[PDB]
Amino acid sequence: DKTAEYEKYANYMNYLYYYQNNELKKIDSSYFKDKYLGLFFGASWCKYCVTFIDSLNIFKKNFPNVEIIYIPFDRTYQEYQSFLKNTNFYALPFDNYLYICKKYQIKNLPSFMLITPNNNILVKDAAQLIKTDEYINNLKSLIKNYIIHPKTFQFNNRFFDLFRNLEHH
Numbered sequence: 580d581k582t583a584e585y586e587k588y589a590n591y592m593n594y595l596y597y598y599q600n601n602e603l604k605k606i607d608s609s610y611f612k613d614k615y616l617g618l619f620f621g622a623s624w625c626k627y628c629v630t631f632i633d634s635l636n637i638f639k640k641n642f643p644n645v646e647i648i649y650i651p652f653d654r655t656y657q658e659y660q661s662f663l664k665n666t667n668f669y670a671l672p673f674d675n676y677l678y679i680c681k682k683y684q685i686k687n688l689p690s691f692m693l694i695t696p697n698n699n700i701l702v703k704d705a706a707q708l709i710k711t712d713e714y715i716n717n718l719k720s721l722i723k724n725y726i727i728h729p730k731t732f733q734f735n736n737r738f739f740d741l742f743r744n745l746e747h748h
Contacts, residue, residue, distance in 0.1 A: 585734075592738035595648065596672055598664040606669070608738055615645045615722060616694040617705065619668065620685055622651065623658035628689040632666055634709050635691070641715050642722075645693065650676050652688065682747045693718075697730040698741045 594605040619635060621628035635647060649670035653659040659673045679685070683692065683703075691706035701721065708714050732740040 588739055588743075589734040589736060591734075591736055591743065592671070594672070595669045596663065597669050598660070598667060601664065603660070603663070611646055611648075612737060613696045615642075615696060615701070617642075617645050617647045618650055618690075618692045618694060619647055620650045620652070620680065620690040620692075621662075621688050622653050623662045624654060625652075625688045631689045631691070631706065634706075635666075635668075638709050642718070645722075650679060652676065679742050682742070694741065695725060695727060697727050698732070698737060701725065 593608050595608055595611070596603060596605050598604065617635075617638070619631075621631065623629070638645070639647060647668050649663070649666065649668040651659050651662070651670055651673055653662060653673065656673050659670075663670050683700075689706055690704075691709065692700060693702040693705045693708075695701050702708050702718075708718070730740075733744065
């Protein structure tokens with residue numbers, strides 16, 4: 580059934596998850612419309628993914644309006660939960676996300692990519708970018724100067740376009 584399948588598509592990723600003191604919360608994905616995003620590919624079992632959290636906390640101090648979204652590759656839901664509870668990041672629901680890795684050719688973990696409001700890639704390897712202090716003013720300038728041409732997303736669903744459009748082929 581096309582209808583059943585396409586209703587799921589139009590509803591794809593309509594919630595992102597986060598923790599507030601041992602309490603798993605959710606937020607409508609509509610909140611992230613027109614927002615710069617930072618996609619953090621990582622996992623609890625990844626040693627330098629855990630240390631990278633310190634870089635992301637500094638990043639968030641200097642770029643509060645860039646919304647950090649955790650893309651998880653945890654082994655177990657229990658690891659996922661404890662990682663969300665320690666970082667307080669937004670996260671995709673616990674699932675297999677190898678397909679996002681393939682679309683963006685993610686080499687290894689951790690990875691961090693900065694996404695414009697219209698789903699363009701602002702900085703592909705932002706994990707290396709956020710290492711030394713010059714990045715702050717340079718990225719303030721990059722974001723300030725960036726011209727956002729309007730884009731209409733399939734099903735008007737920005738995460739479906741970002742994670743599932745066929746353009747990588």
